[PDB]
Amino acid sequence: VLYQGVNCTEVSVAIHADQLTPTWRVYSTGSNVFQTRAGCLIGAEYVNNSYECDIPIGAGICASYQTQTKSQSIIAYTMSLGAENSVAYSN
Amino acid sequence: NSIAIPTNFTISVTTEILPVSMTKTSVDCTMYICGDSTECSNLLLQYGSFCTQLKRALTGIAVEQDKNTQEVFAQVKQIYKTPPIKYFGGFNFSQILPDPSKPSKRSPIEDLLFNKVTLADAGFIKQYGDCLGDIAARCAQKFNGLTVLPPLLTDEMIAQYTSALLAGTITSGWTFGAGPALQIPFPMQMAYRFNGIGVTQNVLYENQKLIANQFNSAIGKIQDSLFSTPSALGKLQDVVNHNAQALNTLVKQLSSKFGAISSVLNDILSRLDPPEAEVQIDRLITGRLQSLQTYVTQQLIRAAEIRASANLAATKMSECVLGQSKRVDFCGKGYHLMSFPQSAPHGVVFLHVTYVPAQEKNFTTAPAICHDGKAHFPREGVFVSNGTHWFLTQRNFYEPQIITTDNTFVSGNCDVVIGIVNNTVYDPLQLELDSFKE
Amino acid sequence: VLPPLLTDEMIAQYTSALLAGTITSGWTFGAGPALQIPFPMQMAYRFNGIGVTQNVLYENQKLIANQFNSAIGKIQDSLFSTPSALGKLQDVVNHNAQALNTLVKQLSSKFGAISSVLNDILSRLDPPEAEVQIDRLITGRLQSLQTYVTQQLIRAAEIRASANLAATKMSECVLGQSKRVDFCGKGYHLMSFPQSAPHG
Amino acid sequence: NSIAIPTNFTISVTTEILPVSMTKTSVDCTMYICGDSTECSNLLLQYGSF
Amino acid sequence: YEPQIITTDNTFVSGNCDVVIGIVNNTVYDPLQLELDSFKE
Ligand SMILES: *[C@@H]1O[C@H](CO)[C@@H](O[C@@H]2O[C@H](CO)[C@@H](O[C@@H]3O[C@H](CO)[C@@H](O)[C@H](O)[C@@H]3O)[C@H](O)[C@H]2NC(C)=O)[C@H](O)[C@H]1NC(C)=O
Ligand SMILES: *[C@@H]1O[C@H](CO)[C@@H](O[C@@H]2O[C@H](CO)[C@@H](O[C@@H]3O[C@H](CO)[C@@H](O)[C@H](O)[C@@H]3O)[C@H](O)[C@H]2NC(C)=O)[C@H](O)[C@H]1NC(C)=O
Ligand SMILES: *[C@@H]1O[C@H](CO)[C@@H](O[C@@H]2O[C@H](CO)[C@@H](O)[C@H](O)[C@H]2NC(C)=O)[C@H](O)[C@H]1NC(C)=O
Ligand SMILES: *[C@@H]1O[C@H](CO)[C@@H](O[C@@H]2O[C@H](CO)[C@@H](O)[C@H](O)[C@H]2NC(C)=O)[C@H](O)[C@H]1NC(C)=O
Ligand SMILES: *[C@@H]1O[C@H](CO)[C@@H](O[C@@H]2O[C@H](CO)[C@@H](O)[C@H](O)[C@H]2NC(C)=O)[C@H](O)[C@H]1NC(C)=O
Ligand SMILES: *[C@@H]1O[C@H](CO)[C@@H](O)[C@H](O)[C@H]1NC(C)=O
Ligand SMILES: *[C@@H]1O[C@H](CO)[C@@H](O)[C@H](O)[C@H]1NC(C)=O
Ligand SMILES: *[C@@H]1O[C@H](CO)[C@@H](O)[C@H](O)[C@H]1NC(C)=O
Ligand SMILES: *[C@@H]1O[C@H](CO)[C@@H](O)[C@H](O)[C@H]1NC(C)=O
Ligand SMILES: *[C@@H]1O[C@H](CO)[C@@H](O)[C@H](O)[C@H]1NC(C)=O
């Protein structure tokens, strides 16, 4: 779940005080809360590895459902634009 | 009988500015019409799916703008890098290639383009701000339910696409645009572009330093022209201003009464009992419904305009940057040689490099030369006379050559051609074969 | 109704300049200074451009000139004889007249009110009732203006697309030679000539 | 092994008609809705920026 | 890729060996000169 336009601190505080209008809660532990430019993304683990964009979120951040380590989950990542190809330019 | 033929040329660089995307807005139906009011929301539900239609229209617009940006910039399958030498025959690309020393890795021209355009929305998380300002200063400041979504591609990621495209065209010309990227020395890419516009390769090789100096000067002129003229980036500022105006109008409409006792919904609920308050609320709902439909209709029309502009920009990228186009005025004014894209907020700026004839001279011409009772026509080029001798020249560059049987072709007699003139048409083999024995 | 910024005389002057440039210098004036070239040599270039050698033009130059003069006379007779040829421009005028007439006619609509005339509402009814009836007429007239403006914006977008196509046609058909099949008419493109028309 | 090749040609002239511009209009919102009526104008003011 | 022998029929001549940057030394074969020599001996 992406909470648009707010800080993750503000969302966590509202959750602890039970002040939010939705009656459902997304299970939240450390590493599962990621601050994006669009808003606070809760329920996806951010990784260093970039990939092709599958489900776009915004501001360069995309998410996908992939097998991690050993165990499938939703992850968030910075979009990869393509493979690198350095052209052997010479005179 | 008079024909004017260029004796010199200028390499000119011009600028074309096209919008690619518009700010992606999002409108909170319940908050705008019935902000934090259960009774109003319950009255709003009696109008059906109206919001849902508004939500779908605005989501479709946001997706369309992401689609337009992706189609315009993501036309290359790989991110190409330039060589570390940065030597391309003497051509200086330091004003169009990324500057590694500054954050965002944008070119000198791209930072100038970004500094010139003032962005009113600049979507990001803004809730942290709250108060302590002199005044809230917005365009709803979020509070009235109107927000701006960030783009999927960031400005840095657009700059990376532009860099990949520049590296591709500089090191491989148009080859990478139609398959694998094949390296070519830059003077040989330009020489082929020269062949593309009907001027031979030797013109470029003989004058390579002059061409490089004209290119570098033209680029410097572009940088100075954009810096000096504050209104150069008119189209992008107009797109930003129109979206800001649409949102300022939509928010300001909330202060209107539309026939109600008061524009504040809480005053209506506080002062009147349900059966009258429902009427006053229905009047306010009608006014807000009209304002939202007008706003969305204008955003859809503007979105269609942006789609058309983005489609034109992608078309120009394919035909001007990833190829060479023979369409007049498509890729700048003059004969098109090559183009370079630059990123700009909400759009793209194209630098169009063209060949422009200069310093023309008028020579006497003739449709054909009659030699031994035969009409000789050019295979390429036109016939000229300096007043004493006839020569064959290129149409786009004065270069006199001896008229020979290797440059012309023969069809018919000399009686049929109205403007035919008498001149000697040399034959190389005969002079040497006659030279060979006698 | 506001006048156009460029008057019919100014449009005629642009068309004349384009014709003089094309005839005297062909495609040259659209990409550098105008350079005079004999017209038959301009056509020889254009024929080579479409894959036909220069001698085809020169051996048959009088046939080509006679076919040209006949075709132009046929254009004048075709436009004179068939009024529907210019329907695309006439519709632009007619639709605009209808939109304006419709908007005026909307003033006579009651929109549920007892009368369409504000002075009658004010004369016969007390302020409160008059205010209700007037507010209703205001709502109906605002709805009519919103409809008119929305329709004008949609037609403006259609006209903008047409104008952009026309600008592309000027640059590629008049100020050059196009290789796009059926872009500049049926057949292999040799050349084009613009003419001014009201609203187009 | 059969190819057709023109032995003659015709120079043809055709006509393409394109709109360029539409009549430019301007609307007096107050006069249209509330022509020469003070009371109507005073109620019209409650619709803001329309 | 389809390599051919460089001859005076495949290339054209304009200018001398100085103004062109990066020119290389290679033999360009004349068709006629070889043929003329065969006509002689
Ligand atoms: C490609 O072109 C750029 C300019 O478009 C060249 O950079 C320019 O290099 C000159 C000489 O190094 C710089 O002049 C010096 O500038 C400093 C600025 O503090 C000044 O103190 C010195 O007295 C001198 O005037 C010039 O500023 C610089 N311009 C920019 C925009 O960087 C670059 O060297 C060219 N490269 C090639 C390979 O031709
Ligand atoms: C290719 O086609 C053109 C026509 O498109 C041929 O030229 C035409 O030839 C006919 C017969 O010679 C001409 O008809 C005659 O015209 C005179 C005019 O005074 C009339 O008195 C005769 O009774 C007869 O109708 C026709 O005018 C002429 N058209 C033009 C424009 O010159 C041409 O000969 C054809 N070439 C080949 C190789 O088939
Ligand atoms: C027209 O061109 C011819 C040949 O390029 C000129 O004649 C040559 O002039 C140079 C001196 O400039 C002499 O060295 C050559 O021997 C001349 N060649 C011949 C064949 O005469 C001629 O002078 C030019 N005329 C004009 C008016 O420009
Ligand atoms: C080109 O040269 C030919 C001769 O090689 C000229 O033909 C002669 O023209 C004169 C009149 O000008 C006649 O009296 C002769 O009988 C013609 N002889 C032949 C063999 O045709 C021709 O007129 C010349 N053209 C120009 C433009 O000077
Ligand atoms: C191509 O051949 C020419 C000779 O035909 C070379 O020019 C000579 O280069 C040497 C270099 O030591 C000089 O000493 C001679 O004086 C030059 N002669 C002339 C007539 O210029 C040229 O250098 C050769 N180029 C390459 C790349 O091998
Ligand atoms: C969230 O609040 C903290 C408070 O220290 C601030 O540092 C951080 O930048 C804020 N994040 C956003 C996205 O505003
Ligand atoms: C991404 O890489 C940086 C490298 O310094 C690291 O600090 C950061 O924790 C990494 N993020 C994740 C989610 O692994
Ligand atoms: C290309 O030529 C320039 C000439 O200054 C030279 O500095 C550069 O090293 C050359 N590059 C290669 C790859 O030969
Ligand atoms: C060349 O052009 C000039 C333009 O003023 C004209 O006066 C001159 O007569 C022309 N000369 C020829 C030979 O066409
Ligand atoms: C063409 O113009 C340039 C302008 O700098 C000049 O340097 C060059 O010598 C000119 N060439 C001719 C042939 O006039």
Side-chain angles (χ1 to χ4, degrees), chain B residues 1-38:
Chain B
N1 61 357
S2 299
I3 186 165
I5 300 171
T7 66
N8 206 339
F9 61 90
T10 197
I11 303 301
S12 175
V13 179
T14 40
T15 301
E16 182 175 5
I17 301 165
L18 298 173
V20 174
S21 66
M22 52 151 38
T23 186
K24 302 190 299 188
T25 65
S26 176
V27 177
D28 219 19
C29 181
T30 300
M31 273 287 311
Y32 181 85
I33 299 167
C34 297
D36 72 37
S37 172
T38 299

Coordinates of all heavy atoms in Angstrom, one line a residue, chain B residues 1-38:
Chain B
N1 N 18.1 31.3 -69.0 CA 19.4 30.7 -69.1 C 20.3 30.9 -67.9 O 21.4 30.3 -67.8 CB 20.2 31.1 -70.4 CG 20.5 32.6 -70.4 OD1 20.1 33.3 -69.5 ND2 21.2 33.1 -71.4
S2 N 19.9 31.7 -67.0 CA 20.7 32.0 -65.8 C 20.3 31.1 -64.6 O 19.1 30.9 -64.4 CB 20.6 33.5 -65.3 OG 21.0 34.4 -66.4
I3 N 21.3 30.6 -64.0 CA 21.2 29.7 -62.8 C 22.1 30.2 -61.7 O 23.3 30.5 -62.0 CB 21.5 28.2 -63.1 CG1 21.1 27.4 -61.9 CG2 22.9 28.0 -63.5 CD1 21.0 25.9 -62.2
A4 N 21.6 30.4 -60.5 CA 22.5 30.8 -59.4 C 22.9 29.5 -58.6 O 22.0 28.7 -58.3 CB 21.8 31.8 -58.5
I5 N 24.2 29.4 -58.3 CA 24.7 28.3 -57.6 C 25.6 28.7 -56.4 O 26.3 29.7 -56.5 CB 25.6 27.4 -58.6 CG1 24.7 26.9 -59.7 CG2 26.2 26.2 -57.9 CD1 25.4 26.3 -60.8
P6 N 25.4 28.1 -55.2 CA 26.2 28.5 -54.1 C 27.7 28.2 -54.3 O 28.1 27.2 -54.9 CB 25.7 27.5 -53.0 CG 24.3 27.1 -53.5 CD 24.4 27.0 -54.9
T7 N 28.5 29.2 -53.8 CA 29.9 29.0 -53.8 C 30.5 28.7 -52.4 O 31.6 28.4 -52.3 CB 30.7 30.2 -54.4 OG1 30.5 31.4 -53.6 CG2 30.1 30.5 -55.8
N8 N 29.7 28.9 -51.4 CA 30.1 28.7 -50.0 C 28.9 28.2 -49.2 O 27.8 28.1 -49.8 CB 30.6 30.0 -49.4 CG 31.6 29.8 -48.2 OD1 31.6 28.7 -47.7 ND2 32.4 30.8 -47.9
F9 N 29.1 27.9 -48.0 CA 28.0 27.4 -47.2 C 28.2 27.7 -45.7 O 29.3 28.0 -45.3 CB 27.8 25.9 -47.3 CG 29.0 25.1 -46.9 CD1 29.1 24.6 -45.6 CD2 30.0 24.8 -47.8 CE1 30.3 23.9 -45.2 CE2 31.1 24.0 -47.4 CZ 31.2 23.6 -46.1
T10 N 27.1 27.7 -44.9 CA 27.2 27.9 -43.5 C 26.5 26.7 -42.8 O 25.4 26.2 -43.3 CB 26.5 29.2 -43.0 OG1 26.9 29.5 -41.7 CG2 25.0 29.3 -43.1
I11 N 27.1 26.2 -41.8 CA 26.4 25.1 -40.9 C 25.7 25.9 -39.8 O 26.3 26.6 -39.1 CB 27.4 24.2 -40.4 CG1 28.2 23.5 -41.5 CG2 26.7 23.1 -39.5 CD1 27.4 22.7 -42.6
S12 N 24.4 25.7 -39.8 CA 23.5 26.4 -38.9 C 22.9 25.5 -37.9 O 22.5 24.3 -38.3 CB 22.4 27.2 -39.7 OG 21.5 27.8 -38.8
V13 N 22.7 25.9 -36.7 CA 22.0 25.2 -35.6 C 20.8 26.0 -35.2 O 21.0 27.2 -34.8 CB 23.0 24.8 -34.5 CG1 22.2 24.0 -33.4 CG2 24.2 24.0 -35.0
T14 N 19.7 25.4 -35.2 CA 18.4 26.0 -34.8 C 17.8 25.2 -33.6 O 18.2 24.1 -33.4 CB 17.4 26.2 -35.9 OG1 17.5 25.0 -36.7 CG2 17.8 27.4 -36.8
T15 N 16.8 25.8 -33.0 CA 16.2 25.2 -31.8 C 14.7 25.0 -32.0 O 14.0 26.0 -32.4 CB 16.5 26.0 -30.5 OG1 17.9 26.1 -30.4 CG2 15.9 25.4 -29.3
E16 N 14.2 23.8 -31.7 CA 12.8 23.5 -31.7 C 12.3 23.1 -30.4 O 13.0 22.1 -29.8 CB 12.4 22.5 -32.8 CG 10.9 22.2 -32.9 CD 10.6 21.2 -34.0 OE1 11.6 20.7 -34.7 OE2 9.4 21.0 -34.3
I17 N 11.3 23.6 -29.8 CA 10.8 23.3 -28.5 C 9.4 22.7 -28.6 O 8.5 23.3 -29.1 CB 10.8 24.6 -27.6 CG1 12.2 25.2 -27.5 CG2 10.3 24.2 -26.2 CD1 12.2 26.6 -27.0
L18 N 9.3 21.5 -28.0 CA 8.0 20.8 -28.0 C 7.6 20.3 -26.6 O 8.5 19.7 -26.0 CB 8.0 19.6 -29.0 CG 8.2 19.9 -30.5 CD1 8.4 18.6 -31.2 CD2 7.1 20.7 -31.1
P19 N 6.4 20.5 -26.2 CA 5.9 19.8 -25.0 C 5.8 18.4 -25.2 O 5.5 17.9 -26.3 CB 4.5 20.5 -24.7 CG 4.6 21.8 -25.4 CD 5.4 21.6 -26.6
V20 N 6.1 17.6 -24.2 CA 6.0 16.1 -24.2 C 5.0 15.7 -23.2 O 4.2 14.7 -23.5 CB 7.3 15.4 -24.0 CG1 7.2 13.9 -23.8 CG2 8.3 15.8 -25.1
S21 N 4.9 16.3 -22.0 CA 4.0 15.9 -21.0 C 3.5 17.1 -20.2 O 4.0 18.2 -20.3 CB 4.7 14.9 -20.0 OG 5.8 15.6 -19.3
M22 N 2.4 16.9 -19.5 CA 1.8 17.9 -18.7 C 1.7 17.3 -17.3 O 1.8 16.1 -17.1 CB 0.3 18.3 -19.1 CG -0.6 17.1 -19.4 SD -2.4 17.5 -19.1 CE -2.5 19.2 -19.7
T23 N 1.6 18.2 -16.3 CA 1.5 17.7 -14.9 C 0.4 16.7 -14.7 O -0.7 16.9 -15.2 CB 1.3 18.9 -13.9 OG1 1.4 18.5 -12.6 CG2 0.0 19.6 -14.1
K24 N 0.6 15.7 -14.0 CA -0.4 14.6 -13.7 C -1.1 15.0 -12.5 O -0.6 14.8 -11.4 CB 0.4 13.3 -13.6 CG 1.2 12.9 -14.8 CD 1.7 11.4 -14.7 CE 2.6 11.2 -13.4 NZ 3.2 9.9 -13.4
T25 N -2.4 15.4 -12.6 CA -3.1 15.8 -11.5 C -4.0 14.7 -10.9 O -4.3 13.7 -11.6 CB -4.0 17.0 -11.8 OG1 -5.0 16.6 -12.8 CG2 -3.2 18.2 -12.4
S26 N -4.5 14.9 -9.7 CA -5.4 14.0 -9.0 C -6.3 14.8 -8.2 O -5.9 15.7 -7.4 CB -4.6 13.0 -8.2 OG -5.6 12.1 -7.5
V27 N -7.6 14.5 -8.3 CA -8.7 15.3 -7.6 C -9.4 14.4 -6.7 O -10.0 13.4 -7.1 CB -9.6 16.0 -8.7 CG1 -10.7 16.7 -7.9 CG2 -8.8 16.9 -9.5
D28 N -9.5 14.8 -5.4 CA -10.2 14.1 -4.4 C -11.7 14.6 -4.3 O -12.0 15.6 -3.7 CB -9.5 14.4 -3.1 CG -9.5 13.2 -2.1 OD1 -9.7 12.1 -2.5 OD2 -9.2 13.4 -0.9
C29 N -12.5 13.8 -5.0 CA -14.0 14.1 -5.1 C -14.7 14.4 -3.8 O -15.3 15.4 -3.6 CB -14.7 12.9 -5.7 SG -16.5 13.1 -5.9
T30 N -14.5 13.5 -2.8 CA -15.2 13.7 -1.5 C -14.7 15.0 -0.9 O -15.5 15.8 -0.4 CB -15.1 12.5 -0.7 OG1 -15.7 11.4 -1.3 CG2 -15.9 12.7 0.6
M31 N -13.4 15.1 -0.8 CA -12.8 16.3 -0.2 C -13.2 17.6 -0.9 O -13.5 18.6 -0.2 CB -11.3 16.2 -0.1 CG -10.8 15.4 1.2 SD -10.9 16.3 2.8 CE -10.2 17.9 2.4
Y32 N -13.2 17.6 -2.2 CA -13.6 18.9 -2.9 C -15.0 19.2 -2.7 O -15.4 20.3 -2.3 CB -13.2 18.8 -4.4 CG -13.6 20.0 -5.2 CD1 -12.7 21.1 -5.3 CD2 -14.8 20.2 -5.8 CE1 -13.0 22.2 -6.0 CE2 -15.1 21.3 -6.5 CZ -14.2 22.4 -6.6 OH -14.5 23.5 -7.3
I33 N -15.9 18.3 -3.0 CA -17.4 18.6 -2.9 C -17.8 18.6 -1.5 O -18.5 19.6 -1.0 CB -18.2 17.6 -3.8 CG1 -17.8 17.6 -5.2 CG2 -19.7 18.0 -3.7 CD1 -18.3 16.5 -6.1
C34 N -17.5 17.6 -0.7 CA -18.1 17.4 0.6 C -16.9 17.2 1.7 O -16.9 16.1 2.3 CB -19.0 16.2 0.6 SG -20.4 16.5 -0.5
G35 N -16.0 18.1 1.8 CA -14.9 18.0 2.6 C -15.2 17.8 4.1 O -15.9 18.6 4.7
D36 N -14.9 16.6 4.6 CA -15.0 16.1 6.0 C -16.5 16.4 6.5 O -16.7 16.7 7.6 CB -14.0 16.8 6.9 CG -14.2 18.3 7.1 OD1 -15.3 18.8 7.3 OD2 -13.1 19.0 7.1
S37 N -17.5 16.1 5.6 CA -18.9 16.2 5.9 C -19.6 15.0 5.5 O -19.8 14.6 4.3 CB -19.5 17.4 5.2 OG -20.9 17.5 5.4
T38 N -20.1 14.2 6.5 CA -20.9 13.0 6.3 C -22.2 13.3 5.6 O -22.6 12.6 4.6 CB -21.1 12.2 7.6 OG1 -19.8 11.9 8.1 CG2 -21.9 10.9 7.3

